[PDB]
C-alpha cells in the first residue's frame, strides 16, 4: 500500500536503474517516402492520442494517465521487425521505419508530451514532466542506434555474432530486471497492475494495430506495406519507456508506475502472436 523507506535511493534501487540503461543499449543496437512518412503519422498521431483518450475514458488518476501517455509517446520497438516478417510484411522496410521513428522521437516525444500534458494537469502542471531528463535520455539512446547501423556496414561479418550476443544478453537481463524491480518495490506492484491499468495495457496495442491498418488502407497502400505499417504502429519501445520513467522521473512521483511498460510488452507480444496466427490460418484456409 505504501512505498519502501528511502525508495529510489538504496543501492538496490540504483543498480536497477543501471541494468535498465545497460539493457536499452543493446535493444537499440540490435535494430541495425509515402509508405515511410505514413508510419510516422500513424505512430505519433494515433498512439499518443489513443493513450490520452483511454486514460480519460477509464477515469485513470493523473499520474497513471501521465505514465500511460508517456508509454504512448515512445517510438516503435524492435518487435515489429520480427512481426512484419512473420506476417508476410517487409522486414527490410520495417527496420527503416523503426529507425526513422526512433530518430524523430528525439524531437517529437517532448513536443507531444508538452501538448498532451495540458489535458491531464490544469494548474499544477509545472515540473510535472522532466523535459531535460527525457531529452538527455532520448539523445543518449541515439548513440547505440547509430553505432548499430555503422557497425553492420563497416564490419558485416562480426554482426552475426554481435546480434546473437545481444539477443542472449537481453533475455537474461529481462529476468534480472523483472525480479530485481519487483523485490525493490515489494507489494506496491498491485498499484501498477490494477484492473484499469491492465485494461489500458491490453486495449492500447489492439487499438494501435487496428488503426494503423485502417489508416494505411485509407491511404491506398499495398497489402505488404499496410500489414507492416499496422504492426509498426502497434508495437512500441517498452524498454525505452521504462528506462525513461525509472530514470528521468523522480521515484516519489512515479513510484511503481515504471512497471507498466512490461505489462504493455507482454500484451503487445501476445496480441501480435494472436494476430499472426489469425492471419496465417486465414491465408491457409482461404
Amino acid at each position, epitope marked *: 500500500f*505504501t*512505498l*519502501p*523507506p*528511502n*525508495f529510489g535511493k538504496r543501492p538496490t534501487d540504483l543498480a536497477l536503474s543501471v541494468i535498465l540503461v545497460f539493457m536499452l543499449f543493446f535493444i537499440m543496437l540490435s535494430l541495425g517516402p509515402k509508405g515511410l512518412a505514413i508510419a510516422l503519422v500513424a505512430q505519433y498521431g494515433i498512439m499518443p492520442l489513443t493513450a490520452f483518450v483511454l486514460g480519460k475514458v477509464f477515469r485513470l*488518476k*493523473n*499520474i497513471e494517465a501521465l505514465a500511460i501517455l508517456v508509454c504512448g509517446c515512445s517510438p516503435g520497438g524492435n518487435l515489429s521487425n520480427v512481426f512484419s516478417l512473420a506476417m508476410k510484411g517487409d522486414m527490410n522496410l520495417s527496420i527503416v521505419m523503426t529507425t526513422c521513428s526512433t530518430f524523430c522521437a528525439l524531437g517529437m516525444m517532448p513536443l507531444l508530451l508538452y501538448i498532451y500534458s495540458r489535458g491531464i*494537469y*490544469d*494548474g*499544477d502542471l*509545472k*515540473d*510535472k514532466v522532466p523535459y531535460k531528463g527525457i531529452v538527455i535520455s532520448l539523445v543518449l539512446v541515439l548513440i547505440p542506434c547509430t553505432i548499430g547501423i555503422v557497425l553492420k556496414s563497416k564490419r558485416p561479418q562480426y554482426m552475426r555474432y554481435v546480434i546473437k550476443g545481444g539477443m542472449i544478453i537481453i533475455l537474461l537481463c529481462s529476468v534480472a530486471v523483472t525480479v530485481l524491480s519487483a523485490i525493490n518495490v515489494g507489494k*506496491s506492484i498491485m*498499484f501498477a497492475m490494477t484492473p484499469l491499468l491492465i485494461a489500458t495495457s491490453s486495449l492500447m496495442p489492439f487499438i494501435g494495430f487496428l488503426l494503423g491498418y485502417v489508416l494505411s488502407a485509407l491511404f491506398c497502400l499495398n497489402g505488404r506495406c499496410r500489414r507492416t505499417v499496422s504492426m509498426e504502429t502497434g508495437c512500441q519501445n517498452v524498454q525505452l519507456c521504462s528506462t525513461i520513467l525509472n530514470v528521468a522521473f*523522480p521515484p*516519489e*512521483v512515479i*513510484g*511503481p508506475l515504471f512497471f507498466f511498460p512490461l505489462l504493455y510488452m507482454i500484451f503487445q507480444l501476445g496480441e501480435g502472436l494472436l494476430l499472426i496466427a489469425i492471419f496465417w490460418c486465414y491465408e491457409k484456409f482461404k
Partner: nanobody
Amino acid sequence: QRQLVESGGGLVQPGGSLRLSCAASRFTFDDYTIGWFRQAPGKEREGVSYMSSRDGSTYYADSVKGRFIISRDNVKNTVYLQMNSLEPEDTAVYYCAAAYRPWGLIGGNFDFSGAYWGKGTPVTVSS
C-alpha cells in the same frame, strides 16, 4: 509563488489566535503533502505543520504542538493552519509547500523535495 497563495497573516496580540490559508491556484490537494513553514529574521526556515492528505498523517513541531492545528477544506481547495495561544517568539513569515506525492509519504517520512512554494504571509505577534 503562482501555484500557492497564502493569506490570513496579520498583527495579533500575545494570547490571541489567527488562521492562515494555502489556496491552490487551480488544482486539488489530493495527491499532495501540504506543509506550513516559517522563517524569522536571524533564523532559517523551519517546518511547523505537515499533512499527508492521503491518509491523514500529521507532523507537529515541538514548539507548536498543542497550539497549531492544520486542516484541509476539500470543497474549497485550501489548507488552513489554526494558530492558537500565540507568543512573542512566534512572529515570522509563514510559507506553505505542496509536494506531488500520488503514493503518499515514502514509508513514514515527510519529504518536500521539488515542492511548490508560496511567497509567504508575515505574522507579527506583539503587544
